[PDB]
Design a protein around this nucleic acid. Sequence first.
RNA 1: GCCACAGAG
DNA 2: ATTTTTTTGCCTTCCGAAAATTTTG
DNA 3: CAAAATTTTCGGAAGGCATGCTCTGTGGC
Lengths: 99, 123, 570, 95, 578, 145, 199, 83
Amino acid sequence: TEGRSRDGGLRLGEMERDCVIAYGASQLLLERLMISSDAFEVDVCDKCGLMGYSGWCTTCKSAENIIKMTIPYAAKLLFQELLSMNIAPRLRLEDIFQQ
Amino acid sequence: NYMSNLPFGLGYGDVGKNHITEFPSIPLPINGPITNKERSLAVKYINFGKTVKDGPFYTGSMTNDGIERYSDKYLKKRKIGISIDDHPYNLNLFPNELYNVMGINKKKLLAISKFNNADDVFT
Amino acid sequence: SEKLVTPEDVMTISSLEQRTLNPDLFLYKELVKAHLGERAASVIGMLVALGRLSVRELVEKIDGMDVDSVKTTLVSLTQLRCVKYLQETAISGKKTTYYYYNEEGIHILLYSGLIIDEIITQMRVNDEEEHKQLVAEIVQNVISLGSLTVEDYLSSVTSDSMKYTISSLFVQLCEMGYLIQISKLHYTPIEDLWQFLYEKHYKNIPRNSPLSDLKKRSQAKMNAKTDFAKIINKPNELSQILTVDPKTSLRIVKPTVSLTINLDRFMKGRRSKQLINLAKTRVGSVTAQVYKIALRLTEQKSPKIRDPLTQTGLLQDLEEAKSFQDEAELVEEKTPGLTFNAIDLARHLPAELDLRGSLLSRKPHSASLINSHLKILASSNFPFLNETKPGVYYVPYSKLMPVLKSSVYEYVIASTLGPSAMRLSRCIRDNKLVSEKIINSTALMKEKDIRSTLASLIRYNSVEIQEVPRTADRSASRAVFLFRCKETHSYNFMRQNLEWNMANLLFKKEKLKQENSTLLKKANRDDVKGRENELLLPSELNQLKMVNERELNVFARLSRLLSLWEVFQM
Amino acid sequence: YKGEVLGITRFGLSKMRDSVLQLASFEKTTDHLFDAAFYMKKDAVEGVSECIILGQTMSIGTGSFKVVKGTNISEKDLVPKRCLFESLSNEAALK
Amino acid sequence: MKEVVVSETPKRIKGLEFSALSAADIVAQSEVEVSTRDLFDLEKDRAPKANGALDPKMGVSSSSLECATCHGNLASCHGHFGHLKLALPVFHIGYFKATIQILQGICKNCSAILLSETDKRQFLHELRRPGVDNLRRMGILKKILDQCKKQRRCLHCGALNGVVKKAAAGAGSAALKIIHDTFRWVGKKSAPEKDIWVGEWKEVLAHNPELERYVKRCMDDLNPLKTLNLFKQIKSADCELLGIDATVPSGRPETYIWRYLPAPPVCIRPSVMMQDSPASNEDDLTVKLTEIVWTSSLIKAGLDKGISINNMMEHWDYLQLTVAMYINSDSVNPAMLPGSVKPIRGFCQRLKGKQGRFRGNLSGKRVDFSGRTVISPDPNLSIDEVAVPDRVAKVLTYPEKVTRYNRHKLQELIVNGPNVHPGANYLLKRNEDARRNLRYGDRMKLAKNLQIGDVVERHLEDGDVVLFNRQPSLHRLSILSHYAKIRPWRTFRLNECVCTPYNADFDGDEMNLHVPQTEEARAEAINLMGVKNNLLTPKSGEPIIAATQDFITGSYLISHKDSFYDRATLTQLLSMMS
Amino acid sequence: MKVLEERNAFLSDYEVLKFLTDLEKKHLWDQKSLAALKKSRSKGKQNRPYNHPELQGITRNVVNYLSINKNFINEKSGISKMSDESFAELMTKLNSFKLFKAEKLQIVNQLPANMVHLYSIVEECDARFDEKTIEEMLEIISGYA
Amino acid sequence: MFILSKIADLVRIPPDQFHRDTISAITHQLNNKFANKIIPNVGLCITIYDLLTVEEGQLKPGDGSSYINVTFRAVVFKPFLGEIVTGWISKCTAEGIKVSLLGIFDDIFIPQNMLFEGCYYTPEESAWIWPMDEETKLYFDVNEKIRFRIEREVFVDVKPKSPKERELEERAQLEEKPPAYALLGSCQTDGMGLVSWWE
Amino acid sequence: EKAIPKDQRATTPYMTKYERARILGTRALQISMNAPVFVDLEGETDPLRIAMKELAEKKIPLVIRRYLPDGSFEDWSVEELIV
RNA sequence: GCCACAGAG
DNA sequence: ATTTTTTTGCCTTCCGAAAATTTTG
DNA sequence: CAAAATTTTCGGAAGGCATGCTCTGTGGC
Ligand SMILES: [Mg+2]
Ligand SMILES: [Zn+2]
Ligand SMILES: [Zn+2]
Ligand SMILES: [Zn+2]
């Protein structure tokens, strides 16, 4: 929340974000802007690229392609808002390790 | 309030539901019973589809274990299939870049399926 | 379903997922997947979706298929005439072959049993079982193989008399236009052919001409037009039958020519059948028989269903459109084989037909009674026939096909949305632009019935609202709404609707066969056939009966749609 | 570097940058998102702003390389074990 | 036995594929259809009514209810979508200009694209080059649209095509209307369409002459129903030239016209808690959703019972305006609605501005483990140190994982507890999911049973790495990383040599203190943003952390030419600096 | 998890038994090892065995299945008594006959002593082999190398 | 009966396991993942035999455990078609007989379509009777050493159901599934059946 | 196949500041998860200082995989890199 | 909760 | 149903109107 | 040669954005 009357947190705005970028600190940026603020474990379907729940994809009606990831909750809220605006931000996933 | 005024024809108890059906209710008159001529026409469709499906030009969808037994001997081979390159192609009807997947100078046989006047469809 | 239906049930028992597909792509992909394999279906679908594509583009646009598989399925599609091609060289010198999709092969696959039945009926071989079976099997082989040579077909037949009868039947098919010679014309596109001819005859004109640019364009396009007509009319000249008397003085088609099915002649026959069905509802039954005989006599030399020059993009000039209309009106009349008299029809009437007492003058195949039938055909409200001179008649196709389209469309509306919808549509079409009050005055039924019926008609593009704004901002309350009927929009929408219905029916049939594949594979065996009641369980027998009945109903409904869909192809 | 003088503005960034999330987070979010939806463009997540929005490691700074732990397994430690049955079996006597 | 091998692979996001949901995609992701204007039913103590805009199947807005779809509370529910079928199609305000452009490029009679085959093939070849970026793609698309505009008659038919545009270009209902002037380029003569038009108007003016003054402004309107029906038979081969990829089922023009409205989950449009009334205020999206339901129900009832066409068109325009306000509130004037003022918070208003999702919650956001305090000088600290109040240090914690090298230290910190500053506030066990507050337990059994994988949130101690920030962040030196020291005087303290990168003076400045919560972030902060490693500004390479005022003066007075010290004063000065 | 090839090689029951006995000796899972250290005396060394319960259970079940006698007759399986050179010489005796790889594998796995069981393992036994060769192979198998 | 499968996998070695030998840690992780579990469309895995290739340990940003791509050969229990094997009868039902190979795999079922002709089941004593001859007093007694022939192997999918369906199913359960791997035994030739009968 | 051999390495042999920071963070995260250390720690408890001590005399078991923009990578041992 | 001004650097 | 404004600058896209140029008769 | 179609140029209006970055309070609906 905002303000010390609500025990709120201090805003790390765009300028401070960009100052952290200028140092090249990728992990510090990830920790400040995802881990300590709005981290959220979510289930994404690998086929249709949409976003599921409880290890289940409500579009494909199957649990075969569900992948658990961690995203900021603001990203999830933005994706649902865009889906409500008839915009489909289908995520595409790739393996982290080249194999 | 945006939810008060109504048109003259409508009433207050008729609005507010919005149940639009997903299933249609206006059928075409083609849904009558089948006749003899239509049944012969339909079995002609079925026979033609069966002929094309088993023909040389199908290009299908995109337990043969490695162990060898004595029962593998005295076992019939399934069916010697006629391939894509076993047809007498007229080479003037095709582009030059498709020649290498055909049979330019290999064995050619023309598979002919005989029409069956009897109705293969069981009732 | 009075209770609430979850979106699960909506998605799984209804056709909502199939309503988002383009009807042309859906129908073509379903037909190719039903007849050929899934790889050919993928290639045809990508060709429809992306337009023309090279082999490299087809490889890089379809996942999981390499160059060899693409080339193999392209060969398979090309043999069945489902893919057109054009080989063009760029300025840099590289040569690329671009493959199209052509509706000719897909319509051949769609009309196949109808084509076979038409061939069986149109040469009066129904009385003779041997000739009928031979004709059916040769037509089925021609359609299934796309194009075949007579020598290769006869190489599988050992009886000399059987070979002679097969050759005679092939000659009979060739002379009446149903089998033609396949060539690179049937694989080259019409638009590309006309573009090539126009460019050649434009570059043929030398420089520094005194005539202007428009005159140069007109001369080049006239020369290209006559060259295009001469090229298109080539397979109809019977050049492949001219080999006469190799031995014992009989006419046989050449053993080195590739014969194929002629779709245009079949569509001419379908047009004749549609006109006969239309005439059956206006002028009698004996008069309908006379009209049937007259149309079947002048069926082979009737004008084509669609003039290919109209598909060259040349209709962007109004002068070209009216020139096409004038040329069609002239060729429907002054063709030597189209005009006919009563004496000509007297030689082809069946023995059962009498004509004797069918006419009452006041309140043996005689020529006067035939002339009376042709007169009442020509004097009817619908222009079934027109008289160039007293006693001679011809079929005015260019003035009869719009009437047939209008009647079929109006009766489809009457059968689906009710007769009041037909009355409203005809009232709006009679006087072109009308208000609600004028509709209520001219068409005597209740105003709320008018409003509900036209609201129902709006959803299918039958009635278009013309808004007349009476304020600076076009508010709906202050404006006044008139109604007009647009023919082209309604015909296009109904054609697309029937196409989607055909595609949905084929998809349902394919899904049913896929889900009963095990029983269908067990039943479709040589030993099991003819012994179904013994080697199968009663439950399996009942399931097989139900599946076969459903498939028969599907194909019959598809035929009935085809009788209703080709009218908008005209 | 794009052949013309673009300028540091929303119209300059609309031509310089082909990404969607970077342009949406800067200025005129609705128009950019709806244009991306209509034209069906694919946004590769390589930019820093996209990695920040989606919560993953940015590709510059400490993310411009990958840390790998060198395993100490030699090749001699990975020789195949004794497969005795498939090695002693021969079918010279059928055939 | 019977278990199946399961394999999980770590996956990252490779890209996004923006598109628009079709009807099948909207219904497929839906859980219940919104088919009631009533949010609550009055007979069940104001419960969320089934098949309403606040149906439980979309989620919960309160912490006391259950989702009845995934059966979870407000904390563990991701929210689920509903769908809402419209009685008549309406134009999407977001895709409205795209609808104008795609109507300008097709024939208004047969839905064919207004291009010759040569131009079509050349443009398709241009669009398919390997090095095509967004700018070149939009340039080619604009060229295609211009060439389509210059076409006077179609190629597949002889129909006349004029100019397609907005009706009035304002802010009311008329701003969401499409008009096609067929006879704008009619010229002088030879137009059969003009003859048909004048025949129609001669026929209709025979009964109502009063419309004669309005014939000039009468042009071919394109209502969303006719526009959708015209889009439906657009050939897929022409969709690439309009900018739409037709290789996917959802890549069609008719997708960009509102037929099914996806009702958002209630977890993103929650009901606000009460302030002074027993009732709870609803979000603007829910109210607009109920209004859309009511208007669509009215339109359906009018179509099924035969209301006047003027009323049907008025309610169609009202539905279109309501959906437009639901998507973008400032696109149309609220005064045009019959009910209507503060403009509602639409979906576009939630995304734009400094308080939107992108700039207020995605690019920058509020963080945990941060403190803000007035700053005061302290020269006795080293330049790489900041003094934190012990009151602040007892709140800002660092989660230290118990290892074999720090077990006794964390045992002692757990024993000390939350009140003594060298202590800890929370303990999280290896096998548990919820951390236990350390002010309620035994604090001696927990210390003795400290396993070698626990996470104990110890107080911020001396030597901890912290981020120290001043909010006008002009350059990267405005945020640095300091080693923490613990002091009792309730203010952040930094050496005055370090206030120059911050541009800070001790006249009331307040600064921020972040505590990185992971080892990687801590090491990156202390090795890339340390004061020792950032003595030089990157703008020019000159030192930025150096002697400030009152340190230059004293050094000058020491190094003055007439400064002479005996051994006692020399030694005292040397001890004074070390 | 990708299966490069479903069947890379064929394992005789002797190879599996030998490998799993070596595994149990390495991980101190044998009955002697668990009875000596973990039972009847205190664990002053605290040399705990391998913790993995699922692998221990499956290897105990397999070693018990392969350790009890093969049911050629109604108390040892014989494969628990064989060695490498005995396996080699017995198998090279088995290649001399007209047997296939699967038939030889089944012969090595089960060690038939019953006449009808040897009938059951190999197909077309009467047609392919006369009584003399069947008697010789039965004597060779029943002799246990 | 036992074969070797070559499988490529990605194993995560936690940093607290760095003190062990790398081969031991990789084998331990693979044993955790694979031992006594059904490899789909392959069979039941017992123990990893050996490792053929190991790649370099790659590290994910945000975690210290090393991820290694490893190719390994594992011993999998997959009786090929036509192989005979000896089991112990566990339970006999109306549809057939259930036999287990002494704890390793308890999912072997022999139906009536491929047992001895004319056999019948008596619910009074829970046994099947084979009328071979006048001395027909032979019983498929439980806990007895039967010998059978594998005739078919069946794999099913482990596809879970909808979360609402799963929730209501467990709610009803609070108020049997097809195994992923199964084999079909038979008795169609002399030499099958009990061990003592053909003594 | 994308690995550049050790002889044909072209990237600078000096360890950049970002490589130092990432190496220290990774080693501290490993030590905080109870990994063994290869230094004689003199009562130090914080993993970061142990990681600094490990880097001080080059007793750290990691290598750096530098990606060139084309796709080929380049493996440098941390003890090989000059700091 | 939304607005509204008031201040701090 | 009379009737104020309450920062200042910059930028692109649209859209008739008029001008410029080519193209038909 | 000048009437008619096509294309380009040129305006004024219509949209949009900016009008710092953080932080602390109150008062009224
Ligand atoms: Mg100050
Ligand atoms: Zn999915
Ligand atoms: Zn939920
Ligand atoms: Zn057109």
